[PDB]
Paper text:
To that end, we have determined the structure of the Vag8 passenger domain in complex with the C1-INH serpin domain using single-particle cryo-electron microscopy (cryo-EM) to a resolution of 3.6 Å. A de novo model was built manually using the program COOT for the region from position 54 to 481 of Vag8. The model of the active form of the C1-INH serpin domain was placed and remodeled to fit the volume, with the only major changes in conformation being within the RCL, which is seen to be sequestered within the cleft of the Vag8 beta-barrel fold. The model for the complex reveals that C1-INH associates with the cleft within the Vag8 passenger domain beta-barrel, with two contact sites. The first involves contacts between two loops at the base of the C1-INH serpin domain (around residues 317 and 362) and one of the longer loops incorporated in the Vag8 beta barrel (residues 407 to 410). The other point of contact is a much more significant interaction which buries the side chains of the majority of the RCL residues between 461 and 474 within the Vag8 beta-barrel cleft, burying ∼600 Å2 on both components. With the exception of a mutation designed to sterically block binding of the RCL in the cleft by replacement of a small alanine side chain with a very large arginine side chain (A231R) (also data not shown), mutation of multiple residues within the cleft to alanine was required to prevent formation of the complex, emphasizing the extended nature of the interaction site. Unlike the native function of C1-INH, which results in formation of a covalent link between the RCL and the target, the inhibitor complex buries the RCL within the cleft of the bacterial protein via noncovalent interactions. Formation of a stable complex involving the RCL sterically occludes C1-INH interactions with its physiological partners.
Complement, contact activation, coagulation, and fibrinolysis are serum protein cascades that need strict regulation to maintain human health. Serum glycoprotein, a C1 inhibitor (C1-INH), is a key regulator (inhibitor) of serine proteases of all the above-mentioned pathways. The mode of inhibition of these proteases involves interaction between the reactive center loop (RCL) of the C-terminal serpin domain of C1-INH to form a covalently linked acyl-enzyme complex that distorts the enzyme active site and is irreversibly bound. While the mechanisms of action of BrkA, BapC, and FHA are still unclear, Vag8, a 95-kDa autotransporter protein, was recently shown to interfere with the complement and contact systems by binding to C1-INH, leading to bacterial complement evasion. Autotransporters represent the type V bacterial secretion system and possess a C-terminal membrane-embedded β-barrel domain that facilitates the translocation of the N-terminal passenger domain, responsible for effector functions, across the outer membrane.
Numbering used by the authors:
A (entry chain A): 122 to 499
B (entry chain G): 54 to 100, 108 to 481
Amino acid sequence: FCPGPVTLCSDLESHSTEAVLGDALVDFSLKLYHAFSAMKKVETNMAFSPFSIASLLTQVLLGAGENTKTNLESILSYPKDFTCVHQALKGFTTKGVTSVSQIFHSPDLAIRDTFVNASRTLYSSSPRVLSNNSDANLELINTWVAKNTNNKISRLLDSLPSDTRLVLLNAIYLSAKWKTTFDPKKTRMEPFHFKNSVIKVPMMNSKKYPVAHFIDQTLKAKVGQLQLSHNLSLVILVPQNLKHRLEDMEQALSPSVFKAIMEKLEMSKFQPTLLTLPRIKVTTSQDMLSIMEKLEFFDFSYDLNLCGLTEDPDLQVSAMQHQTVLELTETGVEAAAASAISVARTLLVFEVQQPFLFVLWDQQHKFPVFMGRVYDPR
Amino acid sequence: GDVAIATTKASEHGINVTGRTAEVRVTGGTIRTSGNQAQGLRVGTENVASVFLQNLIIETSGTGALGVSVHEPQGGGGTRLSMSGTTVRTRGDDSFALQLSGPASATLNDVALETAGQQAPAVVLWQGAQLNAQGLVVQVNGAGVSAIHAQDAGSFTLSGSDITARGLEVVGIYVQEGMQGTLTGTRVTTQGDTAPALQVEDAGTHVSMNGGALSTSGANSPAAWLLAGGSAQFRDTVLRTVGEASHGVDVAAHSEVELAHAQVRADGQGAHGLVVTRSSAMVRAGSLVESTGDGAAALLESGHLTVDGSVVHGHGAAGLEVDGESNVSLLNGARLSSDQPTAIRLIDPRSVLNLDIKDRAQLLGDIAPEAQQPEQARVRVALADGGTWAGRTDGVHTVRLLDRGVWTVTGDSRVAEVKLE
């Protein structure tokens, strides 16, 4: 037996799950963040896209067997028979962040037509087939990914293995911009505290930028929410003072904690504010294989079963890569500035002067599309 | 030269003097318009018109309505307005009692204007708009955002007036985008829910107060908040700030407060008498700073606090209580007591606290982190010409003492170094 061809579930459950899908996405994002913060170096800003990782792993699942099926199902924190998730995932796909997920394999490797057609229907793409050799195959990998992401991801994958039976691949970059243009001129050099030393870093300033701010005591943190285009919100968590180390907040962060924080935020209001924040530009390539190992998952390493995808007795992911790009600057969607007739009276002043934990959020489906942290804002 | 009443239906512009370059000198009577966006006494024009609204009631009522709101273009000097009595009362979503646009000029003596709208400030002054006011009793309410609101190079001087804002997120006196405010006799008041009594922020604006009992209440509501380079300079004020999370004086980045000979008493739950952040306060000839609450009264964080001839007091919890890279400097008898042990607490053990004491100062308290720490910390101390520490530290690094320096230690204390002279 191998899993049967998927059934397009009725539109009834198409939105009866989006809640469960969002909660599972949040849980998975927390788990994957913990894994990443493990693998990466201590004072190294990072960014990743639980949305894209989730989508690619769902692709694998749809191509998954039975035991690995269950393992990855638990890893993603999905309910059993969570079929519409596939179609459900499509609903979550937002226009503000552009993603590219793909599967490559050796031309020798055989791909079941059922999976090919089903994936083409749902994910609008099919497993690309590699060339006879590998080196030129890596060249093709890089070129395809680069030209299918508007050239944003220039050199995605380099350390490709000599032998490569199968490969997954994924890369996403944010395209939404500030819903309220920041002034360029206001950008100034200011003090940032990575450690005892205080550095002079560029930061943009807004007189009365509409922020949604409050303090969560449990984590002992200040949370500030900013607006973007395409119905997206940038949540930034900063330690209460200059003493509380960001490691402390990260470790103290728990699923229920984060969920309560996000809900209380979304119910808040965007009171004006004197806002100071450093230019965020985080790029991150990373081998998911280590992360998958550090999430109790091993099928990508051992005894991988992917009947729904192939038939090769020797099945294994040669190298699975991910890349994420985030860049935010004065390039707002529109200059929202007002005139003298205003009485705004900026209420609460907000300025980030220490490494912070930032999650980009949909708020149209309440899942964290992006997640990571910033230490060196330069 | 009108002398009598002028009522009106629900239609705007009870009395307007748009042009014809003349004067009205309305002697008295009453205007009681009630239209929507109607204004009793607009005086400006589309694109010198001195008026004198002697005692008269302008009790308009209507959405967007507003009492006399003379506004004039930038050129040709300005226009002159003069009032008296004139209990101008409005009740509208955005009704202004006095909005004064470019190059305006007004002088008031017994205005006593009231408003009850949604976001309605009492008197807003736009570009130009110099104002001289006596005996004002402006009192606001509702969910608005400010009592007198001065903006963009305006120049206002209040004498013996009182401002009593109410409603959540209401600011007593809000000055920003350049100003030269001067208050003398004012007794600005407030109700809670983030209602700073006096907010000043341009890096070009400057408020100079004199004996004005700025008083707040309710949730976090700085008595005086100096932001983005604002510059307050008090004279015998009373910044009573009895309110949860409040702050006697919050001086923010690039701001500078020249407090001098004025009581600054913060009470209630966690609240600091004076919170200086990356700014420079200077309590010259001051008279007090109390906390009496959970938090300390003199929270420095990258600030150049300079007490002088005044008592910083940790009456409730703690004294200075630095957490950051402070530059404190007491002198001329700054009795920085705490009515408790650990005068200068400091959460961060390595907070670079270049403390000081000179020529008369008394540090009558301890130093201490929030825990027990034997490590190496970035804290200094200096004394001279009579400077006298009188406490135990357990947490200092160097305690260099100059001529007349007197540490007068009291108990167990691990100190990384000393230098007697």
